[PDB]
Write a protein that binds this ligand. Sequence first.
Ligand SMILES: O=S(=O)(O)O[C@@H]1[C@H](O[C@H]2O[C@@H]3CO[C@@H]([C@H]3O[C@@H]3O[C@H](CO)[C@H](O)[C@H](O[C@H]4O[C@@H]5CO[C@@H]([C@H]5O)[C@H]4OS(=O)(=O)O)[C@H]3O)[C@H]2OS(=O)(=O)O)[C@@H](O)[C@H](O)O[C@@H]1CO
Ligand SMILES: O=S(=O)(O)O[C@@H]1[C@H](O[C@H]2O[C@@H]3CO[C@@H]([C@H]3O[C@@H]3O[C@H](CO)[C@H](O)[C@H](O[C@H]4O[C@@H]5CO[C@@H]([C@H]5O)[C@H]4OS(=O)(=O)O)[C@H]3O)[C@H]2OS(=O)(=O)O)[C@@H](O)[C@H](O)O[C@@H]1CO
Ligand SMILES: [Br-]
Ligand SMILES: [Br-]
Ligand SMILES: [Br-]
Ligand SMILES: [Br-]
Ligand SMILES: [Br-]
Ligand SMILES: [Br-]
Ligand SMILES: [Ca+2]
Ligand SMILES: [Ca+2]
Ligand SMILES: [Cl-]
Ligand SMILES: [Cl-]
Ligand SMILES: [Cl-]
Ligand SMILES: [Cl-]
Ligand SMILES: [Cl-]
Ligand SMILES: [Cl-]
Ligand SMILES: [Cl-]
Ligand SMILES: [Cl-]
Ligand SMILES: [Cl-]
Lengths: 466, 465
Amino acid sequence: ETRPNILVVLCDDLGYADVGFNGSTDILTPELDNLAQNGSIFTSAYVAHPFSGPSRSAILTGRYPHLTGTAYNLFHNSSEDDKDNMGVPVEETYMSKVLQNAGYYTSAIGKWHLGAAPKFHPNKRGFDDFYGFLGGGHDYFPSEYQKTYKAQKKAGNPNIRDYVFPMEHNGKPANETEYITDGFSREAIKNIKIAAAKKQPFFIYLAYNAPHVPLQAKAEDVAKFAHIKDKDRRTYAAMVYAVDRGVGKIVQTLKETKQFDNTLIVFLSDNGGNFNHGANNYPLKGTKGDTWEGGYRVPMFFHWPKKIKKDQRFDFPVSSLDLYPTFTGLAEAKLPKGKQLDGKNIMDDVLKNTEPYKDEMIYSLRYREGYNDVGARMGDWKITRMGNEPWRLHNITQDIGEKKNLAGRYPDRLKEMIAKTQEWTKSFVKPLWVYSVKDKELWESGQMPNYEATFEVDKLVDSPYH
Amino acid sequence: ETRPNILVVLCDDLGYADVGFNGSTDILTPELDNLAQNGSIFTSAYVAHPFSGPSRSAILTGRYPHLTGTAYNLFHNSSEDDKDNMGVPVEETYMSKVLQNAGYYTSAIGKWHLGAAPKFHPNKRGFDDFYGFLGGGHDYFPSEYQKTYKAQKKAGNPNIRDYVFPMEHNGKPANETEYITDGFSREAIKNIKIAAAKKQPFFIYLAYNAPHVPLQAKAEDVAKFAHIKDKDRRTYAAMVYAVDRGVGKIVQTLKETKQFDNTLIVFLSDNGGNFNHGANNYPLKGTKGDTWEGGYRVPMFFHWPKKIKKDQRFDFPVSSLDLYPTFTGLAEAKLPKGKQLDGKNIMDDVLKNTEPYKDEMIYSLRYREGYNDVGARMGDWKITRMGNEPWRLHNITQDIGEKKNLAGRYPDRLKEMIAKTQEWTKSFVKPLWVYSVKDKELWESGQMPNYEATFEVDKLVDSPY
Ligand SMILES: O=S(=O)(O)O[C@@H]1[C@H](O[C@H]2O[C@@H]3CO[C@@H]([C@H]3O[C@@H]3O[C@H](CO)[C@H](O)[C@H](O[C@H]4O[C@@H]5CO[C@@H]([C@H]5O)[C@H]4OS(=O)(=O)O)[C@H]3O)[C@H]2OS(=O)(=O)O)[C@@H](O)[C@H](O)O[C@@H]1CO
Ligand SMILES: O=S(=O)(O)O[C@@H]1[C@H](O[C@H]2O[C@@H]3CO[C@@H]([C@H]3O[C@@H]3O[C@H](CO)[C@H](O)[C@H](O[C@H]4O[C@@H]5CO[C@@H]([C@H]5O)[C@H]4OS(=O)(=O)O)[C@H]3O)[C@H]2OS(=O)(=O)O)[C@@H](O)[C@H](O)O[C@@H]1CO
Ligand SMILES: [Br-]
Ligand SMILES: [Br-]
Ligand SMILES: [Br-]
Ligand SMILES: [Br-]
Ligand SMILES: [Br-]
Ligand SMILES: [Br-]
Ligand SMILES: [Ca+2]
Ligand SMILES: [Ca+2]
Ligand SMILES: [Cl-]
Ligand SMILES: [Cl-]
Ligand SMILES: [Cl-]
Ligand SMILES: [Cl-]
Ligand SMILES: [Cl-]
Ligand SMILES: [Cl-]
Ligand SMILES: [Cl-]
Ligand SMILES: [Cl-]
Ligand SMILES: [Cl-]
């Protein structure tokens, strides 16, 4: 057996400038930085959607959420009955199931957000082990949330928020006793040791909910950030530091079990930081949920000592959609018949420092209340529509903050990129669920999605009097 | 004659953190800072719209642009024919004309943006003198724009941008020879001296186009800002510094003419900074054009040595709409019959440190392509809708950056403020012009303005399941 172990370390709402290797000056991430410095830092890494549910759907299915009907978040406490189909389609085979069928020991830890009904459960979607929670977020201290859950259960509360539900281990009570970031790190260590004892390659999907709200941190970690005056930034920094501590213990475990050299560690965020709740996306414009770069360009590194050189910087754009074909290629796994994928097996490009998306697009489209936000990048160029304002064209390599609209200078390039992006939307399916009552009314009237209006150009800038 | 002179120094797209007295750490504005420190700094000053045309219309008419039909910008090179009525309604009397009729010597300098046809001209709107340009912006170096203008005319260009048109002085060519910020400062000094010789109180509307794009600065000013590493912010800083130099020369002139003590100087920006083009609105969220605070909360001071004490900070919210009734009050000027005003005479509130908008609203509504952005503030509380997202309630005193939505914590307060804001929109008129072809299509179909949809609340947050 020479196939590598694969560890995905996925943070939740981690800001672009909030790890040291991607520019942080106030948040300390020495363990993540050491891995990044000993592998490949991706300076133009994108997720397939600027917020969690659709982004995580894309990671595990390998498809844009607009093709699977999962481009809106599931609501909190979404239906746990199979009959309601509130989850990613079961026919869309996850890479975990592909790796499991190829003989990998598979483990999911932390946040799911891909369906709370039994047919959507991690154990039915290719994970031998699951430890975590099914919804979109969770309170961080068991001594707090277990007391709240128990009191509200006894009081007969019918609206108990899923943020205080007991976590689970393979459908049984987890009985967590630690700050849950530490608990997730503990379970990752355990599953690494299980794989080593089995002498089986592992795939671990470690989906920390940190630094997603609520901003809750251990006093021991907060103490290391007294140099930060803003309380939210200080708490957020401590939350990221807790992840870094866990990564350090995971690395030590990989070394002890002699799995370190032939493990591919992939670290990223599921979307941009929310700059209302502690995050910093510098030098990108915008925030979680935007199609500015700040919404869906994320930190990422690959660390794999057997193959990936130290101190590498990979500057060509890549997508979290690339993880599915890259991982199944490394696992020598056969895809299910008819499986469709929107990403690329990029490992050879990473090893050769070549451009996987040369002359091809990486996209985002985010549904708003009556219009769509869009981003589309090819090479050095990006088109952006935000707030239904006029279309922008940016040289994103020379103008990473999207400050200088070049649409008037290069109209032909703008319209070529518009045409390809519009063609992409012709492949979309209807959402299986929307998020608000407003959404439902808009889709039912045809006011959404109205892709045709999204790709208007001239009428947004022309005067009716000239 | 006891009435004070009034000098309005209005910058164009000046960011919230881009003058020293309002928190700048890198842009140097010693003359403006000295005036602010010797008067009253307004820490919650608002303009009536988050971009220039409608904001400037509101300043001179004293009414929200939604009541005068002027809530969109005029397009570049807008019609110069009276028949097309591309300008602020002539019936909506400007405070310049009221002051002129009250015996003030009146002068407008720099940017207009209120109509380029003759009936909209400053000289027809209460200004004895006008030196500047009629449209929305201008290139800064005459040696550059006069060369481009003359060449494009010879090239038979039918679409010459008004940014390079020759400036004017009372309808005649201005023949400007200086960096135009310096030229505007020079003309302000001249008009101060004219009023001193006339022994007439002056009203001077000094509408610098700085620091609005294009980012163009003098080498002598750029040399002061080597500590600014970002290239656009360095140029932008030098553009603000040139305004500061001119203010210093204006102050020296007021002292020499013995007008300084009884001049009210009001300094402000017409809207928030554009953070794509050098500006910084810290600690506010957002940028020019938004209904986040960063779009329309601006730096402002009042300086008037005879009455306003030094080292004052005025923390209650105020509006640029207050300038019209405050100035006409100081001028003891009678308003025209039927004139309506949306602001307040706030001078006694400023001197007494009392709250002019107690239990009342300061508003913004900005039209977008198919929806409306809104902001509304009463006391410590603000409601915001941006991008047609769910409504937000902020304690703007505790949460100036609009980071923490309290809509779920205080739903009754949110809905009370929304109800009052919706009632305000019931008074609106139709825009006399819109900006884009898309705007025209949306208004003609009835998709705009749809104020009813703007004030939906519950359906934006409730799940259908
Ligand atoms: O009254 S409540 O606010 O509901 O009660 C509060 C606590 O619940 C809240 O906790 C977080 C703050 O608001 C919600 C939580 O954040 C949300 O988490 C989601 C995942 O669980 C998701 O990440 C949300 O972002 C999305 O929001 C919608 C849907 O997709 C888009 C957007 O359209 C995402 O954002 S963006 O556009 O990409 O930026 C995120 O905002 C809320 O919980 S929940 O979401 O209602 O479940 C509650 O736990 C506590 O007890 O009381 C709090 C009181 O304020
Ligand atoms: O082809 S161009 O790019 O137009 O040519 C350029 C030069 O003209 C430009 O110069 C500035 C950059 O874009 C325009 C100028 O900025 C604009 O100035 C306006 C005032 O003159 C106004 O401030 C504009 O903001 C508004 O834009 C619309 C209308 O109201 C809102 C928004 O909906 C305002 O913005 S916001 O929402 O509040 O933020 C501002 O963007 C452009 O000039 S013009 O506007 O076309 O007249 C040109 O002079 C030179 O020759 O070539 C340049 C090449 O790029
Ligand atoms: Br599956
Ligand atoms: Br638990
Ligand atoms: Br090893
Ligand atoms: Br008038
Ligand atoms: Br000139
Ligand atoms: Br004096
Ligand atoms: Ca997330
Ligand atoms: Ca302006
Ligand atoms: Cl938020
Ligand atoms: Cl926001
Ligand atoms: Cl082109
Ligand atoms: Cl479909
Ligand atoms: Cl069009
Ligand atoms: Cl811009
Ligand atoms: Cl912007
Ligand atoms: Cl209340
Ligand atoms: Cl509603």
